[PDB]
Design an enzyme around this catalytic site. Structure first.
Site, PDB file in Angstrom:
ATOM      1  N   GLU A   1      36.753  32.583  32.812  1.00 25.83           N
ATOM      2  CA  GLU A   1      35.594  33.259  33.392  1.00 25.83           C
ATOM      3  C   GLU A   1      34.823  34.121  32.390  1.00 25.83           C
ATOM      4  O   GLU A   1      33.670  34.476  32.629  1.00 25.83           O
ATOM      5  CB  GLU A   1      36.003  34.093  34.609  1.00 25.83           C
ATOM      6  CG  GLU A   1      36.448  33.261  35.803  1.00 25.83           C
ATOM      7  CD  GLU A   1      36.517  34.070  37.085  1.00 25.83           C
ATOM      8  OE1 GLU A   1      36.083  35.241  37.072  1.00 25.83           O
ATOM      9  OE2 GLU A   1      37.001  33.533  38.104  1.00 25.83           O
TER      10      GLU A   1
ATOM     11  N   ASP B   1      25.098  37.864  37.525  1.00 26.18           N
ATOM     12  CA  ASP B   1      25.837  36.624  37.731  1.00 26.18           C
ATOM     13  C   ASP B   1      24.893  35.472  38.066  1.00 26.18           C
ATOM     14  O   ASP B   1      23.674  35.615  37.982  1.00 26.18           O
ATOM     15  CB  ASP B   1      26.912  36.788  38.814  1.00 26.18           C
ATOM     16  CG  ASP B   1      26.329  36.991  40.199  1.00 26.18           C
ATOM     17  OD1 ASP B   1      25.092  36.920  40.350  1.00 26.18           O
ATOM     18  OD2 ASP B   1      27.113  37.219  41.145  1.00 26.18           O
TER      19      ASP B   1
ATOM     20  N   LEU C   1      32.084  41.948  40.395  1.00 24.95           N
ATOM     21  CA  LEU C   1      30.792  42.311  40.969  1.00 24.95           C
ATOM     22  C   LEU C   1      30.741  43.788  41.352  1.00 24.95           C
ATOM     23  O   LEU C   1      31.664  44.312  41.977  1.00 24.95           O
ATOM     24  CB  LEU C   1      30.470  41.429  42.179  1.00 24.95           C
ATOM     25  CG  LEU C   1      29.211  41.770  42.983  1.00 24.95           C
ATOM     26  CD1 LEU C   1      28.578  40.515  43.562  1.00 24.95           C
ATOM     27  CD2 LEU C   1      29.519  42.779  44.084  1.00 24.95           C
TER      28      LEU C   1
ATOM     29  N   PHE D   1      40.584  33.105  42.779  1.00 29.17           N
ATOM     30  CA  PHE D   1      39.470  33.807  42.146  1.00 29.17           C
ATOM     31  C   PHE D   1      38.214  32.943  42.082  1.00 29.17           C
ATOM     32  O   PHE D   1      37.100  33.457  41.985  1.00 29.17           O
ATOM     33  CB  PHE D   1      39.844  34.272  40.736  1.00 29.17           C
ATOM     34  CG  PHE D   1      40.469  35.638  40.692  1.00 29.17           C
ATOM     35  CD1 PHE D   1      41.587  35.879  39.910  1.00 29.17           C
ATOM     36  CD2 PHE D   1      39.940  36.680  41.433  1.00 29.17           C
ATOM     37  CE1 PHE D   1      42.162  37.135  39.865  1.00 29.17           C
ATOM     38  CE2 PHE D   1      40.511  37.937  41.395  1.00 29.17           C
ATOM     39  CZ  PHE D   1      41.624  38.165  40.609  1.00 29.17           C
TER      40      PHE D   1
ATOM     41  N   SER E   1      48.873  19.256  48.396  1.00 34.51           N
ATOM     42  CA  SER E   1      49.190  19.719  47.048  1.00 34.51           C
ATOM     43  C   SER E   1      50.060  20.972  47.086  1.00 34.51           C
ATOM     44  O   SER E   1      51.013  21.098  46.315  1.00 34.51           O
ATOM     45  CB  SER E   1      47.913  19.983  46.247  1.00 34.51           C
ATOM     46  OG  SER E   1      47.263  18.769  45.908  1.00 34.51           O
TER      47      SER E   1
ATOM     48  N   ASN F   1      47.810  14.889  42.568  1.00 31.58           N
ATOM     49  CA  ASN F   1      47.057  15.135  43.790  1.00 31.58           C
ATOM     50  C   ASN F   1      45.887  16.087  43.556  1.00 31.58           C
ATOM     51  O   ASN F   1      44.766  15.830  43.996  1.00 31.58           O
ATOM     52  CB  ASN F   1      47.981  15.689  44.876  1.00 31.58           C
ATOM     53  CG  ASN F   1      47.610  15.203  46.260  1.00 31.58           C
ATOM     54  OD1 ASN F   1      47.099  14.095  46.425  1.00 31.58           O
ATOM     55  ND2 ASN F   1      47.875  16.027  47.267  1.00 31.58           N
TER      56      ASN F   1
END
Ligand SMILES: Nc1nc(NCCc2ccc(O)cc2)nc2nc(-c3ccco3)nn12
Ligand SMILES: CCCCCCCCCCCCCCCCCC(=O)O
Ligand SMILES: CCCCCCCCCCCCCCCCCC(=O)O
Ligand SMILES: CCCCCCCCCCCCCCCCCC(=O)O
Ligand SMILES: CCCCCCCCCCCCCCCCCC(=O)O
Ligand SMILES: CCCCCCCCCCCCCCCCCC(=O)O
Length: 448
Positions: free
Chosen positions: A209, A218, A230, A302, A315, A330
């Protein structure tokens, strides 16, 4: 054979390679678009300096070894011109170090900071300073403007007789060479240490990120800082900064430290974990995972949110059954993977192995090239230090027996060899150079 006919032959050979080798470097950058980045702008300038060494500096060296009678300033140019070339090289190597620095520690703003236009600007200026520094003795700092066997208006052109040693040691060596070299040593060391940093959930998302120490907007125009933290949806930078000062506990002015960004991230993780534990689907899986695999699950939350991850019914199940490989296959069939393959591929590898491998690889490739360039500086230092050190001896111990001529011209030959080694290094360690060289030699040189 003469004891000088060897000196002259050797140095002529060095000149030919210097020219041929460094012409090849420039040729490749011109032909190949994948070598037309800003970093190679400085490599080319450096290559230019090395070509000039073979063409002028070396012939000058041979001319001056005769000690012929010449006008003062004319004699200084022949003796000092090589200093111009050397200084330019220093500036080029320094700019490469810095370039690689802000490209590996601050990748988010590298292209907006380092541009072709600015590179060319810095280069032009460095050539001006190089002339100013290299030809300083010509500007007045010399020993002839105030000597027999040559007639008045002329002096025997002996380097140590016309070029002041206090200039060579204090100004040239200490200030203009030694300082930059140590500065380049510190920069590269910091680059390397950063690729060997200890990995964790913070360094994990710092790669996925990114890290910001200044408030930014953003994708949807909301004020954010640190790692995707944020601050507010209000259209006011002023308001955003006030929110920041509340969280940090001080007047930031819109800028925080790395440490402070980490504390914010830690808080964000704690919250996500609490959210995960309240979810009846995610809790059983999270609790069954190890520390590293938990980070990969938190990574997904996240990005997609807790409701988003909870959608991976199958999964998740495999993950709790510790069927790592099945889960991987998967997860690879998901729309999440299709959207961000690079990030997802790293997260999945983390589920597979339970290590930080995928993230350690990123750092070790993002630095491998800087090792090649660092070798360039090490060789420069090796080729030039001997001569500088000998100058210091002569300078600081006046009544000691001077270094023998054989040693003197050996240090001079060595320094000239430095203008030959670079092309060989690019060939051995840099793939895109090596491939372009082969193409040039086989196609244009042999003509087939
Ligand atoms: N000291 C010195 N001498 C020469 N040439 C003179 C060699 C010499 C050595 C001993 C002697 O008695 C008479 C002449 N070129 C030189 N180039 C440099 C140099 C280049 C970069 C830094 O130092 N230093 N330097
Ligand atoms: C005539 C114009 C330039 C042609 C250069 C011919 C090559 C001469 C060899 C001297 C420079 C060697 C530098 C590194 C060698 C490249 C190795 C390789 O890719 O095979
Ligand atoms: C007096 C005449 C002798 C000339 C001596 C100096 C010659 C050395 C000049 C070498 C400059 C190389 C220019 C490389 C620039 C190429 C840049 C590019 O390809 O984009
Ligand atoms: C590979 C070679 C490329 C050609 C490079 C040009 C070489 C320039 C030679 C430098 C000569 C030094 C000046 C000689 C002073 C002459 C004094 C006099 O004639 O009275
Ligand atoms: C890229 C251009 C670099 C500048 C160099 C231009 C080429 C000069 C060739 C030889 C210059 C001779 C210097 C003056 C001669 C000194 C000795 C003397 O006074 O006879
Ligand atoms: C950017 C142009 C600078 C020109 C001033 C240089 C004065 C003397 C320069 C001698 C060799 C300069 C070669 C510089 C080549 C630059 C390569 C590049 O910018 O891509």
């Amino acid at each position: 054979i003469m004891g000088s006919s060897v000196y002259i032959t050797v140095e002529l050979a060095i000149a030919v390679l210097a020219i041929l080798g460094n012409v090849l470097v420039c040729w490749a950058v011109w032909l190949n678009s994948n070598l037309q980045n800003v970093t190679n702008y400085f490599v080319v300038s450096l290559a230019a300096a090395d070509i000039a060494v073979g063409v002028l500096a070396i012939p000058f060296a041979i001319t001056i070894s005769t000690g012929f009678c010449a006008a003062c300033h004319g004699c200084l140019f022949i003796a000092c011109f090589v200093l111009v070339l050397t200084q330019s090289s220093i500036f080029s190597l320094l700019a490469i170090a810095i370039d690689r620095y802000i490209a590996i520690r601050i990748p988010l703003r590298y292209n907006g900071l380092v541009t072709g236009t600015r590179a060319k600007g810095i280069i032009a200026i460095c050539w001006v300073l190089s002339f100013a520094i290299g030809l300083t003795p010509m500007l007045g700092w010399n020993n002839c403007g105030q000597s027999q066997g040559c007639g008045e208006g002329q002096v025997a052109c002996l380097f140590e007789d016309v070029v002041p040693m206090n200039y060579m040691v204090y100004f040239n060596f200490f200030a203009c060479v030694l300082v930059p070299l140590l500065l380049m040593l510190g920069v590269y060391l910091r680059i390397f240490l950063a690729a060997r940093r200890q990995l964790n959930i913070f360094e994990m998302l710092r790669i996925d990120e990114g890290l910001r120490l200044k408030i930014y907007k953003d994708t949807e125009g909301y004020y954010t800082i640190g790692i995707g933290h944020l601050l507010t949806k209000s259209p006011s930078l002023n308001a955003a900064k006030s929110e920041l000062d509340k969280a940090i506990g001080r007047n930031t002015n819109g800028v925080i430290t790395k440490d402070e960004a980490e504390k914010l991230f830690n808080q964000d993780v704690d919250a996500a974990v609490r959210g995960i534990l309240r979810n009846a689907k995610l809790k059983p899986v999270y609790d069954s995972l190890d520390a590293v695999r938990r980070a990969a699950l938190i990574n997904m939350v996240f990005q997609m949110g807790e409701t988003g991850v909870a959608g991976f019914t199958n999964s998740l199940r495999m993950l709790q059954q510790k069927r790592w490989d099945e889960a991987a296959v998967n997860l690879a069939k998901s729309r999440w993977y299709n959207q961000t393959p690079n990030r997802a591929k790293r997260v999945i590898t983390t589920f597979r192995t339970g290590t930080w491998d995928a993230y350690r690889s990123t750092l070790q490739k993002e630095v491998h090239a800087a090792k090649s360039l660092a070798i360039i500086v090490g060789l420069f230092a090796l080729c030039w230090l001997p001569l500088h050190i000998i100058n210091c001896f002569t300078f600081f111990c006046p009544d000691c027996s001077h270094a023998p001529l054989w040693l003197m011209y050996l240090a001079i030959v060595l320094s000239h060899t430095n203008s030959v080694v670079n092309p060989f290094i690019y060939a051995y360690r840099i793939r895109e150079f090596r491939q372009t060289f082969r193409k040039i030699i086989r196609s244009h040189v042999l003509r087939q």
